[PDB]
Design a protein around this ligand. Sequence first.
Ligand SMILES: Cc1cnc(Nc2ccc(N3CCN(C)CC3)cc2)nc1Nc1cccc(NS(=O)(=O)C(C)(C)C)c1
Length: 127
Amino acid sequence: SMNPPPPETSNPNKPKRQTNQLQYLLRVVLKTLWKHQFAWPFQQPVDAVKLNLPDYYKIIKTPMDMGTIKKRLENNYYWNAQECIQDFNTMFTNCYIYNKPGDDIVLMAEALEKLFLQKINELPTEE
Ligand SMILES: Cc1cnc(Nc2ccc(N3CCN(C)CC3)cc2)nc1Nc1cccc(NS(=O)(=O)C(C)(C)C)c1
């Protein structure tokens, strides 16, 4: 049943930075993916209660979603771009772990992942 607390979006004792890459990750990469027709399952933490998936957080112990990432970027939570890319990678990987190849949700993630890889290919060099 119940949902866990969502991942933190602020941590006062974590060092933070703004870099041009992190700017780009928010203004271009996240904001492009966000507007995609297949984005909505990934825009917030999985609501396992509403979905009647009581084993979701039994299996997925490092949950991640674009809603969390968006807020992290907005709050300058990250030290560098790679920390943020890792959160995207976790989100995709979680999807592929929990679901079956060819499930609709996997097709949705895959469309987003392909687009994600296209967009980070154009990440500007650091500073
Ligand atoms: C990111 C993600 C990864 N995996 C899955 N798997 C999944 C979802 C639904 C099902 N159904 C199976 C039988 N059926 C009757 C109910 C549900 C099976 C597997 N889902 C995801 N995201 C995702 C998929 C569908 C719906 C929502 N909505 S949500 O969590 O309430 C909100 C609006 C907060 C994002 C969110």
